[PDB]
UniProtKB/Swiss-Prot annotation:
Highly expressed in testis. It is found in: Nucleus; Chromosome. There is a cross-link at K41 (Glycyl lysine isopeptide (Lys-Gly) (interchain with G-Cter in SUMO2)). It comes from Homo sapiens. Residues 9-113 form the Bromo domain. This is Bromodomain-containing protein 1. Component of some HBO1 complex composed of KAT7/HBO1, MEAF6, ING4 and BRD1/BRPF2. Component of the MOZ/MORF complex composed at least of ING5, KAT6A, KAT6B, MEAF6 and one of BRPF1, BRD1/BRPF2 and BRPF3. Interacts (via PHD-type zinc finger domain) with unmodified histone H3. Interacts (via PWWP domain) with dimethylated and trimethylated 'Lys-79' on histone H3.
Length: 121
């Protein structure tokens, strides 16, 4: 149908906007602490601590399969990156501190993306 196609164009455009959002967020992580999944070879107990691991490469795979229906879904995954790190790592660590900075800096970007998603529909 023509409606399914119009729907598919909106999803494609959301995917476009979310890609740019993801690039901006990932720039706030120049150390690449959140680039890739936590290694289960190097942290064998990680899944005893963290039930839903997340990272920027896993979000990117979802993004490119057009797997985010809306900004809320995308934000949930970003928040997992931050929140998992802040539980697993202690306050006085470079990892926890990196998550705090990413959260604080990502807020600005996410604040405008919400306005753009509402605005362009």
């Amino acid at each position: 149908s023509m409606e399914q196609v119009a729907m598919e164009l909106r999803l494609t455009e959301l995917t476009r906007l979310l890609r740019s959002v993801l690039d901006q967020l990932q720039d706030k992580d120049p150390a690449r602490i959140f680039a890739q999944p936590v290694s289960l070879k190097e942290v064998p107990d990680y899944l005893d601590h963290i039930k839903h691991p997340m990272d920027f490469a896993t979000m990117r795979k979802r993004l490119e399969a057009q797997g985010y229906k809306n900004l809320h879904e995308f934000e949930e995954d970003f928040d997992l990156i931050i929140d998992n790190c802040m539980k697993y790592n202690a306050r006085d660590t470079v990892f926890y501190r990196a998550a705090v900075r990413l959260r604080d800096q990502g807020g600005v970007v996410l604040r405008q993306a919400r306005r753009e998603v509402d605005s362009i529909g």
